[PDB]
Design a protein around this nucleic acid. Sequence first.
RNA 1: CGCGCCGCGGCGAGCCCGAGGGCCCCGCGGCGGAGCGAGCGCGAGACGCCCCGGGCCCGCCGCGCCCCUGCGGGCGUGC
Lengths: 314, 59, 178, 56, 148, 38
Amino acid sequence: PTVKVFGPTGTQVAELPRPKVFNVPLRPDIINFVHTQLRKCLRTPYAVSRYAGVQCTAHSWGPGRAVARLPRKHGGIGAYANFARGGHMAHPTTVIRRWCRKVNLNQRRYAVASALAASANAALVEARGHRIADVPSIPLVVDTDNVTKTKDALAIIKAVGVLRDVERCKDSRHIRAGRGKMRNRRYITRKGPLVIYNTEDVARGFRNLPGVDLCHVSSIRLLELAPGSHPGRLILWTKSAFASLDDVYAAKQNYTLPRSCITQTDIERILQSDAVQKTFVPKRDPLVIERKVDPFSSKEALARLDPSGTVMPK
Amino acid sequence: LNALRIVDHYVTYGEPTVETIRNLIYKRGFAKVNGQRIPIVDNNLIDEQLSKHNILCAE
Amino acid sequence: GIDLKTGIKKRKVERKEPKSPNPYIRLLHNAFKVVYENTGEDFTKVLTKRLCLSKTNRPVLSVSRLAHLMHKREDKIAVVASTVTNDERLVTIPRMTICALKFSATARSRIEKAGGRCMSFDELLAEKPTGDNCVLLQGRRSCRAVCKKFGSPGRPNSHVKPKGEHKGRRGARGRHSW
Amino acid sequence: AKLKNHTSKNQNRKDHRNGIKKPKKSAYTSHKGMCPKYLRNLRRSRANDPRQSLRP
Amino acid sequence: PTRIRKSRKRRGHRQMGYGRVGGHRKHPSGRGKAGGLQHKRTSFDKYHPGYFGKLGMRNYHVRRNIEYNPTINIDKIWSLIPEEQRDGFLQRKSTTEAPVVDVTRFGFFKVLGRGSLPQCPIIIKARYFSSDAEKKLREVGGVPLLVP
Amino acid sequence: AERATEKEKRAALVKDHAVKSAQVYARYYIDLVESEKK
RNA sequence: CGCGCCGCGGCGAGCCCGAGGGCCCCGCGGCGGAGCGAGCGCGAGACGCCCCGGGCCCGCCGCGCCCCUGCGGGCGUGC
Ligand SMILES: [K+]
Ligand SMILES: [K+]
Ligand SMILES: [K+]
Ligand SMILES: [K+]
Ligand SMILES: [K+]
Ligand SMILES: [K+]
Ligand SMILES: [K+]
Ligand SMILES: [K+]
Ligand SMILES: [K+]
Ligand SMILES: [K+]
Ligand SMILES: [K+]
Ligand SMILES: [K+]
Ligand SMILES: [K+]
Ligand SMILES: [Mg+2]
Ligand SMILES: [Mg+2]
Ligand SMILES: [Mg+2]
Ligand SMILES: [Mg+2]
Ligand SMILES: [Mg+2]
Ligand SMILES: [Mg+2]
Ligand SMILES: [Mg+2]
Ligand SMILES: [Mg+2]
Ligand SMILES: [Mg+2]
């Protein structure tokens, strides 16, 4: 099959073959494992000071003075314990915590490919959160070729149907709920489209827009493809980006994309087919269970066991 | 008999009439089927389980 | 009260479902579990239990072991619920049909170049769900190095090696060495 | 101070809780301790029987 | 992650699995490996035969690249020939154009004899041979050779 | 189906067996506590 | 941080974000692949869904017999 390509104005203009990276199986378990390890590698260490609580002079008074045995400053003030005001922590935090995590190169490439394949579904992009109800194709390729004024770049995103997703992002900016607003994280906005470009200047006209991000096709970032560790981002490909995907995967030395497999849609079809159904054979009829009750109560209840009636009813 | 005389102080026992046997089965009769305790209420269940031994009804 | 202790043992725990997060394993196990309940075939019952095992209970199978086992019955489908690797010490491979969970890239290339077929368990499910003209096979469950140190080295009937490095002599030169 | 020296009071109940085990079926046929002059002649006889021999 | 650990399931239990009679103290057996011949002797003899004592000659400085000695069996020899060429060599069991395999180029010194070869003449050059590697090679029509 | 026919016929055969065996066994029980008396 | 066992992911007779160089690209050791012997050193196919046992092969210790390049080779026997 071929993807469609649209002008910077909205009509159909060209067709390109599907890159083979979209046929990789969908693995929300592998995308979650990689997203977790690589988002831990951006952390800045923190720790308390190594002298904190231990700059004072304090020793135990011992028994015989009607007081508890912790170390005390000259004068008798509690010190040097985690349960004393002003003492050290029981186990102080240290910067030698292992902050980063390792991931193999094979599993890093699987996560990018599985996250890119999720982006080719109009049902997973919708369920990720985006507004794509007025979009020509969800594998959305568009010919722009140079964009410098934000005013022109806003005109394309309208000219196609991604206008409601950026206003979704624009009207959502707010002050966050907790302590985070003292620590340089005061505002929050939702995330919109991702424009992926190869050989054309677009970054100047797209960057200022709320909820927009920029990726040169040779280096695609998994934290951008799966915000929140959820796979299906909406992606606006430039034409030259979309037409170099296979060249990029040919540039990875001794690498082959993983093997395509079937889905639960495909398994549910087979079982309802004459090659599998013709092997079916019914179960025996199942036991029949009543409650206990006294046969001697009535004529009819007793007759169920013995019909003749030699047995007295009561 | 010799095993039962070992546990005499736990048990009481004797010889039942055909009237005692009948009331117990008709009133307190349940069946073991696949490890389940199943109410015995009609001849359909004694036949299904014991017909190989030529027992077909409650009598 | 009720006495339910004498003559009665403690119940047992076994894997009744795979614990893998791979969606392809859940789909296949759930599918073969269905076929068993509507067939009662003991081939689909052993195969449903193989798909719950824990990857140390699913050792690999090489092509040369299959070529050896399938000899004289070469018209049948080998069924393996594990990975099929390659054996480069065998120079020539015969033609055979193998159905496995996974093939190595080099083992697939060799199997096909002889005229053979590499099936998947969903190809098996569609064409032969109850195992007609199929044989179930597995590798050596006790081939791991870890399972070679189980026990008490040092006891006179052990035949097991110790774990670390031991540079001495005491107890290591046979009986009457302590 | 002095503590208790010995008892076997609870030990027959611990011995019975997992059943009384039985030795492996293959210990009854172990060659260990049989006459070597009998175990030599046993191997020789089979190696020269075409129904039993396992030589290549 | 701290939030899935067994130790957080013991909040409210007075003693975090260490018992009331015994308790959790500092070092009730001593530190490290001490005691192996006295009060841990039942442990050291059951699992570590040959931990105590001396055995054999000592060398005050071992030369790691003298004692290095890689090896290859005869059943692995034909996998050193690339696949594109193996078929043709088997096709024409030549005495006058037999394949030459120099195993030191691949980084082996001695050739051992486990396995078997295909019915095809071949020449193997190495630094040392085992006695049945030579025997199985001459059984095939091959020759062994020594190389610098 | 054929299951409902066999289950229909079978119970009928069992029922007439229940009226045969009841009368005979009632006859047997009266006859024991007689034969001892004689 | 080191050691043991278990589970899950990727690849599989292979595997691998060393350090470094141009969330992407390139990147040695190493460990695994053969063991046994204090050492000189010698060096594994024969069977088997799996498991358990039997039989046989390799090294270390002993010993018949035959031989070429010889306290060296071959063919055997035994714990
Ligand atoms: K101080
Ligand atoms: K105190
Ligand atoms: K105190
Ligand atoms: K890798
Ligand atoms: K990645
Ligand atoms: K050990
Ligand atoms: K504990
Ligand atoms: K204790
Ligand atoms: K201590
Ligand atoms: K100590
Ligand atoms: K010690
Ligand atoms: K010494
Ligand atoms: K020695
Ligand atoms: Mg004090
Ligand atoms: Mg403080
Ligand atoms: Mg608050
Ligand atoms: Mg016991
Ligand atoms: Mg408790
Ligand atoms: Mg308390
Ligand atoms: Mg204690
Ligand atoms: Mg005590
Ligand atoms: Mg205490």
